[PDB]
Amino acid sequence: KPVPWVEKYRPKCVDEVAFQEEVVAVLKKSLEGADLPNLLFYGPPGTGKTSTILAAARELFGPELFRLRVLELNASDERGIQVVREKVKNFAQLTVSGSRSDGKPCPPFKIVILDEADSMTSAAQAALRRTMEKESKTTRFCLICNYVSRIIEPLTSRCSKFRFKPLSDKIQQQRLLDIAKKENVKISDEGIAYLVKVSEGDLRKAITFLQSATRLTGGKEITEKVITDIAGVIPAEKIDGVFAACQSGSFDKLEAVVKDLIDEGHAATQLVNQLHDVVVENNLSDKQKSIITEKLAEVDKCLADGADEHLQLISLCATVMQQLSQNC
Amino acid sequence: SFQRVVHVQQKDDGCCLWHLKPPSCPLLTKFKELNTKVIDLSKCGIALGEFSTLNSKLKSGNSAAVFMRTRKEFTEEVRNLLLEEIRWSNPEFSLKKYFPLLLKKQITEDMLWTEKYQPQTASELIGNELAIKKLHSWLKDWKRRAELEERQNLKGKEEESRLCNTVLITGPTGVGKTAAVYACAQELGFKIFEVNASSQRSGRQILSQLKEATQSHQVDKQGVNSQKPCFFNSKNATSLILFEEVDVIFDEDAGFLNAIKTFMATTKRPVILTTSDPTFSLMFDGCFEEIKFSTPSLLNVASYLQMICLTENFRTDVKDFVTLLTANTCDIRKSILYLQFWIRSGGGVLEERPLTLLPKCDSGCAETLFGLKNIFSPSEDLFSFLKHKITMKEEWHKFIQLLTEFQMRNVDFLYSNLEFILPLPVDTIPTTAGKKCSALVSHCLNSLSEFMDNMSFLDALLTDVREQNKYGRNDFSWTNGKVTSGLCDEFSLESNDGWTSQSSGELKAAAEALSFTKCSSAISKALETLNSCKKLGRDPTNDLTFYVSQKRNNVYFSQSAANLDNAWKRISVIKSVFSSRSLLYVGNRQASIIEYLPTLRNICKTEKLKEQGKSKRRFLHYFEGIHLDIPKETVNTLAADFP
Amino acid sequence: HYELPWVEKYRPVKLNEIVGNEDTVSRLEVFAREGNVPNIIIAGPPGTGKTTSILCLARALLGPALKDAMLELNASNDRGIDVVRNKIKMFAQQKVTLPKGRHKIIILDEADSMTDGAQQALRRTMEIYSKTTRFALACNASDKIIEPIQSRCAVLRYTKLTDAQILTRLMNVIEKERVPYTDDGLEAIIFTAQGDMRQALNNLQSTFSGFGFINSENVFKVCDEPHPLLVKEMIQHCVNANIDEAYKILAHLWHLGYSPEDIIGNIFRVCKTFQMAEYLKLEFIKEIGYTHMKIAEGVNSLLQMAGLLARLCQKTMAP
Amino acid sequence: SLWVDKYRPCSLGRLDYHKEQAAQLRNLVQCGDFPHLLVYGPSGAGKKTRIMCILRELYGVGVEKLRIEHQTITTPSKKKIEISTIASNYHLEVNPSDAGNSDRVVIQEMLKTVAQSQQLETNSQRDFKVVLLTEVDKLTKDAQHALRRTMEKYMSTCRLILCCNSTSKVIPPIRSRCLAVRVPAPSIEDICHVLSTVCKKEGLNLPSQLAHRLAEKSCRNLRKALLMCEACRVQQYPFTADQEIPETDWEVYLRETANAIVSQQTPQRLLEVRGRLYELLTHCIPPEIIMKGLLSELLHNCDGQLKGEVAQMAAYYEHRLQLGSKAIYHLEAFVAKFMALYKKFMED
Ligand SMILES: Nc1ncnc2c1ncn2[C@@H]1O[C@H](COP(=O)(O)OP(=O)(O)OP(O)(O)=S)[C@@H](O)[C@H]1O
Ligand SMILES: Nc1ncnc2c1ncn2[C@@H]1O[C@H](COP(=O)(O)OP(=O)(O)OP(O)(O)=S)[C@@H](O)[C@H]1O
Ligand SMILES: Nc1ncnc2c1ncn2[C@@H]1O[C@H](COP(=O)(O)OP(=O)(O)OP(O)(O)=S)[C@@H](O)[C@H]1O
Ligand SMILES: Nc1ncnc2c1ncn2[C@@H]1O[C@H](COP(=O)(O)OP(=O)(O)O)[C@@H](O)[C@H]1O
């Protein structure tokens, strides 16, 4: 029966998304003419691209025709682009007559909101280009991505491009305070600030983690322990213990440290992320930073490949220990 | 309309990065001018033999050797000598009880050797003895029941017996399930009504055409009754239904399983099912007596194939049919058909081998089986080619084509026979001079490590021809692996790639050949100095020899360097112990094996230890005392040791 | 008046004109001479002469009764489940009078395209009816054939034709067709057809119909491969560890429109017969295969090609 | 029904450790809109016990009455594949990684069957059927993309409970929606208390120091501790202070292989270690386990300088094994490279 939090407090219409000035202005200009061009939104996640395009779809159409006249699709389908093209062809072939009692008839074009458009190979991108050219005046395409450089020349040239700069910490802290006071959750500022810090500037992960914490510990305060164990973030004491173990130069306590990390159920990818984030912002030499970062990249490739966690972390910590103790 | 697709960016004033300028440092302003001048190809012509194995001289008279072999029929003395030679090769074979039978079978041919040497009697079958005696006893009891029914009819005018009306037979392909059924039926005079997969067998057709075969008599009971009506729709003899390949169900065969279940319920005549799918024993719901055909012993079938060769008046050796059976996984049908094709083509190689344990031997069957004679000269031998140093271009091409022909089958040829192919001694399992000896051992070990590093590189970072672990996971796993082939006529419609198959095959073959050539050359130059160490008085040959099992020395070459019978008995052990009722709900699979199985083996070994001590009888009853219903054979298997 | 293609104009009509795979063709010759052919499955690369071999064997076995006692099913026919159930079984049950030792032949070309249900049905109708009919099937990848048919057949292996054989039959066609040529054109045609007689004959007919003279320039103007002298100069620069000239020539190749796949294919084909040391050849082959799997997996840019160039250069300058 | 199963807790109040975690899970299911649960932690931490506990707190008592069914489905390459499944009228549990790289069917079509079964079944209790995909870490990237789109599409009909030992191979859009349940391995005193409770419920009185030795030998694996306690109960009726902890038999086989490699350095010993490793692989033990065991066994004998090099070598060849197909090449090549490193290290 209920809905998740992320789709609940998204803005209902345009002009309600803060921190954006010209994107919403051009969107309102396009909506006043009742004609949305082929649209491309690029920006880091948790910024409001999906919220903006869904608000524009709700504004131009009616809410009873909002779901019937839009189609959300993802480009990471496992069966190639044949299934995606057949779904787009089926959606564009089907036409649903609509009527609005507000006074404005619905525009004839249908909306295909396609997410993760930057994970697309060039052959599939050209196929999508020819699909969009086949339905130029009957279906206006929406492409969602973080990196516009991955989209090849023809689709990028024929689309209205909009950049979404991620929100500041104060704005998302205020929005999370509004969420907390709206949903009757007892909240201190420190918890919301730590949520913003562990979400890494993504409002979607912050909202999801807040809803997860307030449903995991119902009718109770939201401490830092629950947020840390829900976001998956390794405690900083563990990271400092890793750094001290590598600085010691003893392999036995190194093995004990990684065994403690593994037996605590801590993910190796998160340990690698935190280790890299601490290594690159320290007073280490550029040679040490270079070798440590190269080993971090190789180990992260091994992890995404799917090798053993314990051996990968042992090797990365051995490289870090040798690099740090070489100067000693 | 052509509206403006404006790139809109929230470019705020500042940030020192929106409006950037080219760097003023001298390195990035010293752009080298691009040159497009390549060499001209019109002046340089491609000489003959540059990119190929083209040579000016051509061999004439060495090839195109027609055989024109007119084999003289063997006399009694030479035949008896071959019989005693095979008897000394296989002392556990009753070779006297079969030779009049095949001699009578042989006494301008239009038969395949599968049907020319078709076993008329079940005693003429080879291997699977318990299964065929079980089937023969079951069908003899059915004959006794039919004769008793006829006696009761002539006079007129069943838990203790436990005669279940159906045997279900399961085993590998070509072990002789249909041969066993037919041999038993002809020996006891039954009449088989066969339902094949080649025929349309839908439920209404099979019941309305074959129910009265079971429910009623035979109108023709004397005369021609050893004939086999294959059912299709476009002394007295008793009926016997047989379903060949029951596991093969199409969409046209609508309701076949319900039909044979009605046949199960309402029969008065024997019903036999034959299938090679091991999973069909689980899916089918009914009461049936189970018979399993195991894979027959390699030496017995090898002696029988040598025997079929003898009755066609050729002599040969045991080992070549051993590796022939190994390549075909002891499939008797495939081996018999290839043996017929091979014998009737006049033979491959005429080499004499005087053995006592006389005509010339006909070794070289497995070489032509893999197509290696189309690559090599008839004077060339495989291991002779592999042991010596490869220098010429044509020898390199022969090596690459051999490895390519073995790479499409995902078989590592040089890896499996690595002991017998390296220039090192191989024996069956039953001070400055020392510094130089250890240095030689170190050099040999470094070469071996380098080669095996390239082999790991080849498996990991090179594409394989056939995509490994496609339907099951990797080898030695107890999840599944009974992946039956397809059963629908609809096409695959897949989007697989084709180029990266023969491209990767050439790549892997070339890399494996070059790595093995490097390793063998390094080992050769390492042991070129072994004579100096032998003169010094110290012999490191005990540390250089290779210890390999007896079963891998019985073949000329192996497609695998492990033991598959070992793996089969293991996989049977884990599947049988973890099919018990209580332990059937352990879901975490890896955890289940590495935690439950060694502790269970420890429990079994401790239980056997307390039983050998003449202790109380109740110490046997821990397994039954926790309601852990494990069969005693597997408990005895778990209680032996860890290999 | 019609120009019959030289593939079909000069197809062999006897089994003694087949070049390549001497042992299997000799056994097919003796089986056509004597008779009682087993159910054969001939597997090999495309173009090596499998269809021609089985057609010549069927012709020499049958003779005047080839129109009646032979049934041919190619991939362009139906070959469905009902076809295997009705038509093949009916031909097997058909009564045809033939001399002693001769059986009816049901040729089933491209058994790879035979669906697994049709194979599952074809098992028993291959097994029982062997007294009157025989089966001659042909494929490329024998793994696509289900294990029961391979159990029910004899598996004959066809290999890639050695370059001497394709040269000899190319010279036979040339001396029968008065083709003006040089030896450079011979080497270019043999290069463009890697053990493929059909590709060699088609390329030869195409360049003779296009330009009328057989040299290397015309052949690579019709076949339009990346030129093997350019790839040889690539490999020769990388032997000397000159990344600048090698990347110059590869940038030239890339700007001509050659794809990554045939570029790395041509690099491997030239590098296989290149004149260098064995260890350097092994490391070059290993790095070429690694880069080729990278192209296979989906990443195929100039950066990967130049990276392979850098690795090949550095394998020489590093011990 | 061993002590790992007879005395397995089925209620959320029975969990003696992770009491705050159990209370949080109970409070989550009191809301009635719990999301997909990605539960991770090392093997033997109790993930299966926790998901059965939250299943019993979620549904009625009928989730104990389970059944075993085999499902056979068609590959897109038109082949039939069969796979076991532990299921009930309330929940269905299917391991999807038994299909090799063809896990995408066992992900998608099986979820289609659960969706249509939930559309057919009605019991007025809850509006979803829990689908439990144990060992989701071993799924391929293509299968995990299929998993992602299926959770995006099938969320209102079924709820997904994924169990894994690591979220490394798990693609990040999967973890962006699933609630993370980190279940760490319980501490030494937790194992001692669980062993004491189990032995007291079995009518025996074990000492504290034997339970502590068993907890230290088990390496924070509760199931291994329970099984070793059961084996010790087999060995001796009283829990003596000199009770020998039953060592894992393939573990001491691996230790003997470690003494075999470290003892003699010759290609003959390399072939003997190869044969022993083949014998150990034929027991269906996964190759990463022998990799980790070999690392832990040979790191005792090496000095402090060689440990980092052997560690990096082990990680590199473990990744080569995971990328590869036959584990024997990568494993034995690690044996060979370690053999060469050892021989060139003790010679100087
Ligand atoms: N500036 C903003 N104004 C209003 N809501 C915002 C703003 N930034 C983020 N949000 C909210 O943050 C949540 C997540 O943003 P979405 O638009 O759904 O996803 P996203 O920003 O496109 O990132 P993705 O989809 O992962 S690439 C939604 O509930 C939005 O309403
Ligand atoms: N044990 C055996 N002894 C002697 N000949 C055998 C034996 N097994 C098979 N054959 C020969 O192989 C021929 C065919 O065997 P089949 O019984 O048809 O094989 P199968 O057991 O039916 O397996 P399928 O039908 O291919 S799944 C027989 O006619 C015999 O010539
Ligand atoms: N060994 C050969 N000797 C002589 N001519 C050959 C040979 N192989 C191929 N040819 C020629 O190439 C033509 C086509 O050969 P095919 O037999 O059709 O190829 P294939 O062996 O059937 O492989 P496919 O059909 O591509 S699967 C023949 O008509 C001949 O002209
Ligand atoms: N609170 C508890 N009290 C006693 N025993 C437990 C408790 N939690 C788990 N166990 C036992 O520990 C073992 C852990 O195995 P399992 O549940 O499969 O976890 P995992 O899936 O992490 O291996 C179970 O067999 C169970 O009997």
Ligand SMILES: [Mg+2]
């Ligand atoms: Mg979105």
Ligand SMILES: [Mg+2]
């Ligand atoms: Mg059969």
Ligand SMILES: [Mg+2]
């Ligand atoms: Mg053909």
